[PDB]
């Protein structure tokens with residue numbers, strides 16, 4: 001924005017760099033960078049920021065509910081006392097209260113297909129369209145693995161793992177964490 | 193955007209229009225409009241994004257731990273079994289992996305002073321210290337009352353109240369909800385730091 | 387209105403949304419939205435549409451009489467010759483025949499308590515009673531070099547303040563709010 | 576409003592009641608009653624809201640600048656020291672600052688063709704275009720005439736006349752005053 005728009009346009013004119021590259025290189029907010037790619041004839045832009053995947057995983061005989069913001073890879077997970085629609089519904093309401101949950105992809109099992117979960121979704125305005133999860137499950141279990149001895153109860157280990165996953169594992173063009181990506185993707189979405 | 197920055201910038205030299213006005217009047221994303229105001233040397237746009245306030249409030253014989261993002265008004269709350277450091281620590285831990293929590297302000301209750309919470313804060317790199325909290329518990333309790341009927345258990349009502357507060361109560365110059373504001377405050381605090 | 391009442395009703399049934407929000411979200415006239423709230427047992431509605439605050443301020447050695455529509459924030463102002471009741475009463479007369487002014491709040495200012503003002507108030511059916519100055523001053527400052535006489539700069543600032551400073555749920559200007567507020571009062575009359 | 580919207584609609588499918596009738600018979604706000612009419616295939620709910628007519632009239636050797644909001648009949652008037660662009664431009668600025676003035680219609684006087692007035696218009700975003708204002712011009716003088724002895728200076732007499740015209744002369748299907756019509760017209764055009 002210190003002429004970042006013109007510097008970026010010339011750069012794109014010659015090399016046709018994607019928006020992530022231009023956003024990072026010239027310090028432009030994503031909405032601006034994307035518009036440049038939009039204005040180009042020889043290009044095109046590159047999951048809805050409101051799509052989430054939910055599923056349960058098991059460890060130490062305990063149940064863990066996991067939610068994954070597909071577009072960013074941001075995770076939210078909790079050790080729940082029982083694989084019941086009620087516990088899942090409660091978990092959804094909380095999730096829905098902090099993020100713009102629009103549609104949730106889940107399996108057609110007893111729990112996620114329960115009437116309680118459906119009630120929550122209806123209330124929250126979440127449509128259920130019912131391996132991004134197999135990856136998260138195993139990455140989360142690995143982080144829990146590498147940090148398990150720092151906590152007596154799994155609950156805490158799990159929360160430590162979520163913390164590490166969303167804030168201490170960086171990558172990509174901007175070298176962002178998953179936590180910064182969800183916040184960025186959604187702030188950008190608000191911009192349009 | 194269709195050379196809108198151009199027109200907006202022109203109109204601004206004359207009227208020195210609000211960012212909300214230029215965004216609306218010229219169909220520009222608010223961040224671009226805000227930049228026009230920042231560029232103008234006759235105007236100026238109008239709390240640290242890492243400051244949160246925690247407190248325990250009571251309703252129907254239950255305990256509700258509430259966390260407020262001071263700069264945004266964004267809330268996060270939960271019914272906990274009892275007012276203990278273990279519950280507080282766990283709550284804090286979940287909060288921290290979710291948002292960039294750097295400083296936390298509390299009332300000094302034994303639960304916030306506990307070694308368990310202190311250990312939680314050290315682990316997650318959070319500094320402890322110590323009207324927003326008070327006023328907020330009131331607004332939440334009020335929404336809880338309006339919604340109580342729709343739920344059997346209070347914990348569900350509490351969560352509906354949080355949802356409503358963060359997403360369905362808008363206002364301010366931007367007409368945003370606290371949920372939309374925190375994402376803006378934090379996303380911005382990232383860019384500047386890049 | 388395209389079955390917007392129906393949609394707003396269910397939104398409120400769950401989240402008990404305020405009337406401004408429902409008016410804006412479902413494109414319903416304020417009177418319809420406020421009725422949804424009034425019908426609900428869990429809520430209560432939302433300053434009187436006819437209340438105005440009148441004051442004087444100075445700039446460049448001149449007197450600026452400022453009138454503020456408390457509920458909307460809309461403003462009206464003008465450079466007057468002297469801070470005398472006579473000028474104040476004439477200003478009021480002009481205002482009153484423009485907006486439904488029912489009550490005017492002011493200080494004990496000599497020119498605000500003069501008999502000539504009460505005369506004007508009594509004629510127009512206005513009842514006398516009893517920060518915006520700073521905002522006006524500030525806008526005038528951003529626009530000063532665009533005008534010669536202070537008069538014109540003042541009006542330019544009023545224009546700016548009333549039409550180019552949007553905000554709130556509907557992103558309205560003070561100018562749009564006062565009209566909407568008053569039109570809405572006509573609906574419930 | 577107490578299910579009155581429902582009743583009103585039922586009756587309309589039968590009588591095709593006027594909006595004033597329904598607003599009155601079912602205690603509904605006029606805007607709700609107008610919608611019912613607009614929603615009916617068999618009925619029709621009967622000038623641009625941004626158009627104003629401007630002109631000067633004389634009385635007692637002084638100049639009165641009058642502005643008319645054509646769609647509502649609403650008025651704004653003032654005694655100006657002289658028929659010059661300088662005075663017209665200041666007047667338009669004040670006006671444009673309170674109402675959404677999009678286009679002004681005037682005669683050909685150098686009074687309104689002045690470059691001073693053109694600068695004022697360009698600044699306020701108003702378009703120019705050199706007998707709706709003749710009727711108001713005469714009725715204003717009439718009201719002034721009957722209220723004159725109530726004020727020492729012409730200045731105050733004129734403002735009393737404007738006040739009376741805008742808020743004390745009702746009519747039309749809605750039984751509204753010009754002051755009420757412009758607001759309704761402007762508020763509706765906003766949405």
Ligand SMILES: [K+]
Pocket residue numbers: 037038039040041043044045
């Ligand atoms: K493209």
Ligand SMILES: [K+]
Pocket residue numbers: 229230231232233234235236237
């Ligand atoms: K600035």
Ligand SMILES: [K+]
Pocket residue numbers: 423424425426427428429430431
């Ligand atoms: K009520």
Ligand SMILES: [K+]
Pocket residue numbers: 612613614615616617618619620
């Ligand atoms: K019709």
Ligand SMILES: [Zn+2]
Pocket residue numbers: 012016017037040041042043
């Ligand atoms: Zn390209």
Ligand SMILES: [Zn+2]
Pocket residue numbers: 204207208209229232233234235528
């Ligand atoms: Zn400016």
Ligand SMILES: [Zn+2]
Pocket residue numbers: 338398402403423426427428429
């Ligand atoms: Zn309600």
Ligand SMILES: [Zn+2]
Pocket residue numbers: 587591592612615616617618
């Ligand atoms: Zn009909």
